[PDB]
Amino acid sequence: MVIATDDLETTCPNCNGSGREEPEPCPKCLGKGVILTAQGSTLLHFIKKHIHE
Amino acid sequence: MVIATDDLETTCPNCNGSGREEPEPCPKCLGKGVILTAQGSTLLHFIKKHIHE
Amino acid sequence: MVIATDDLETTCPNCNGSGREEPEPCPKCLGKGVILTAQGSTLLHFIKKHIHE
Amino acid sequence: MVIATDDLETTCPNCNGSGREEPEPCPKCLGKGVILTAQGSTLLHFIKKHIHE
Amino acid sequence: MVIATDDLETTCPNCNGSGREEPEPCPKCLGKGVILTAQGSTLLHFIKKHIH
Amino acid sequence: MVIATDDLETTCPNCNGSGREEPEPCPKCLGKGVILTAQGSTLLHFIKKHIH
Amino acid sequence: MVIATDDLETTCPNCNGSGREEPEPCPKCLGKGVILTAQGSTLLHFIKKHIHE
Amino acid sequence: MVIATDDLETTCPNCNGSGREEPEPCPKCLGKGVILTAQGSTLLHFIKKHIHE
Amino acid sequence: MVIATDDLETTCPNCNGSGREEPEPCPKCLGKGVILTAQGSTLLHFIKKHIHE
Amino acid sequence: MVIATDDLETTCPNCNGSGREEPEPCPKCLGKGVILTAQGSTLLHFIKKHIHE
Amino acid sequence: MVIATDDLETTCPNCNGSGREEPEPCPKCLGKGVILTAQGSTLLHFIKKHIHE
Amino acid sequence: MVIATDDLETTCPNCNGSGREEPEPCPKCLGKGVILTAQGSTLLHFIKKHIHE
Ligand SMILES: [Mg+2]
Ligand SMILES: [Mg+2]
Ligand SMILES: [Mg+2]
Ligand SMILES: [Mg+2]
Ligand SMILES: [Zn+2]
Ligand SMILES: [Zn+2]
Ligand SMILES: [Zn+2]
Ligand SMILES: [Zn+2]
Ligand SMILES: [Zn+2]
Ligand SMILES: [Zn+2]
Ligand SMILES: [Zn+2]
Ligand SMILES: [Zn+2]
Ligand SMILES: [Zn+2]
Ligand SMILES: [Zn+2]
Ligand SMILES: [Zn+2]
Ligand SMILES: [Zn+2]
């Protein structure tokens, strides 16, 4: 596909994808275990802005 | 355009697009008359995950 | 219980519950690992229609 | 099924399902063409109460 | 004011404002005790339509 | 009614109300077939801002 | 009706309906005043899961 | 226009519209720089009450 | 408790907590009967900013 | 980048990006200062439809 | 930190943290596997109350 | 106050607060110009989990 999951987000380098920084959620990915790429950021920012929610 | 509607969703095979399994909504598409493609699924999963809402 | 979880949803036969079709989310269940039954669809459609979000 | 759509909602008596009272939407069903039954009201009230959203 | 509360909603005729039909919520107002006026309905429909 | 639906929104001139630009939704009204008036925009902006 | 309010929830034993624990809200029902039954939990879990919102 | 923006909200007295109270947001307007009029408060209450969300 | 309810909100000075200014909602607390403290404003602004809704 | 921001939206021709038609929000972009392209419209319509918001 | 996850929630005493009471979700934690502390209940109630959503 | 804005979020080191990486939004702060501290991440994760909407 033109836009795959790996084109949108990548494994968070702080927690290595666990989403944790025990005993708290990893602050770099907020527990998701992934961070956004530029393309993922661009799409997410557009959506949030026009739907707000 | 790079991503058209037909790249995101296609006619549901169970209701042939009516979104209905009278007198109830079609269980496969939840009343939408369409089902997602792999590309549509990938994009929707990404958005819901990061916006949560 | 008049309506149990298995009256509302059932394991997705394609990913067998993992919600995955590596490296993407499973297109059938949108990564949830389950598909709706007719009863689950009737209730969810009603709720969404009258609440919306 | 245990709970069918007709157990949850019925045709709005003020517009007969058109959802309209020209040139405005029908005030009794808010344009949906349907009103709730006692069962529908009971379930929806419970869901909105515990999710609000 | 131009549009006051009573211009938007009015006491539910079924429960008289209790929002109840013991031991269940009133089916006509969904437990709110009030129903929409034509003006209230017009405004609410517009908002939901464009905000969802 | 102080504010009617026609005071809030009007027919989208691009799709002439269809909401479509087959095989895609009309980019101007997002498939609604209507666009906002000044009054509708004033109210919607207010609500969105304070509720989100 | 097949599913009545009392089938979904019952009065809270920590606050007995009040929902308060002056000066704070009751933690057991989060100021709701009631606690879900198994059937209420099952339905609410299902709805939240599929609507997220 | 029967209802203009100034009929719904007015510049906040405390922050004079900046929406700030360094280094924090202004507590009277919640950082918005405006406060509601009676009419705005009336409409917003009605909307939140019927849409909640 | 490091942060109690009275640390986040206080009774409204205009309606004395009733949340009413018959026949309308109190324009200062939007019918809540309370107003935010600085701490409450800072927390609410942060949450709404990163979730939005 | 397969889809850039300029591929999704463009400066509003009425307010030239200010989002204002003083003293009111611009009616063409609802104060956002931008309007959707066909591609942005296609994507937003899809998202709202399958999430609703 | 001032307010740690442990200060906000604790392991559900009923399901011992799995969030399950097979084949259903645990009715005490609603499938979350944790319950709220007094501090957690206070913050959550404040946020729900003022975001209404 | 016990928890100040800077206890919750800090300037994004990628865009230094602009929230931009022209001609796109900054991928590290998603255009907000700030990133979360450990405490902010802990609070947000909590609210989202127990409200997620
Ligand atoms: Mg919902
Ligand atoms: Mg809303
Ligand atoms: Mg929220
Ligand atoms: Mg959304
Ligand atoms: Zn991480
Ligand atoms: Zn179908
Ligand atoms: Zn699957
Ligand atoms: Zn009707
Ligand atoms: Zn009633
Ligand atoms: Zn159009
Ligand atoms: Zn209680
Ligand atoms: Zn202010
Ligand atoms: Zn007040
Ligand atoms: Zn404009
Ligand atoms: Zn449990
Ligand atoms: Zn940045």
Numbering used by the authors:
A (entry chain D), G (entry chain J), K (entry chain A): 1 to 53
B (entry chain E), D (entry chain K), L (entry chain B): 101 to 153
C (entry chain L), H (entry chain I), I (entry chain C), J (entry chain F): 201 to 253
E (entry chain H): 101 to 152
F (entry chain G): 1 to 52
What does the paper say about this structure?
In Bacillus subtilis tryptophan biosynthesis is regulated by two proteins, the trp RNA-binding attenuation protein (TRAP) and Anti-TRAP (AT), which are involved in sensing levels of free tryptophan and uncharged tryptophanyl transfer RNA (tRNATrp), respectively. AT antagonises TRAP action by binding to tryptophan-activated TRAP and preventing its interaction with the leader region of the trp mRNA. Binding of zinc ion is essential for formation of AT oligomers and for its function. Here, we report two crystal structures of Bacillus licheniformis AT, which shares 66% sequence identity with B. subtilis AT.
The asymmetric unit of the high-pH form contains four AT dodecamers (48 subunits), all with identical architecture. The high-pH dodecamer has the same 23 point group symmetry as the low-pH dodecamer, but the orientation of trimers within the oligomer is inverted so that residues buried in the low-pH oligomer become exposed in the high-pH oligomer and vice versa. In contrast to the low-pH form, the zinc-binding domains of the high-pH dodecamer participate in trimer–trimer interactions while their C-terminal helical regions are buried inside the dodecamer. In contrast to the low-pH form, the high-pH dodecamer does not contain any significant internal cavities and has a more compact structure. Trimer–trimer contacts include a number of hydrogen bonds, formed between pairs of residues Thr5–Glu24, Glu24–Thr42, Lys48–His52, Ile51–Glu53 and Cys26–Ser41. There are also hydrophobic interactions between pairs of residues Leu30–Leu36, Leu30–Leu44. The high-pH form contains Mg2+ ions, coordinated by the C-terminal carboxyl groups of three subunits. From the crystal structure alone it is not clear whether the formation of the 12-mer is induced by these ions although it is likely that they stabilise the conformation of His52, which is located in a disallowed region of the Ramachandran plot. Zinc-binding segments (residues 9–36) of the high-pH dodecamer are more flexible than the core area of the trimer despite their involvement in trimer–trimer interactions. Similar analysis of the high-pH dodecamer of B. licheniformis AT resulted in the ΔGdiss value of 38.2 kcal/mol.
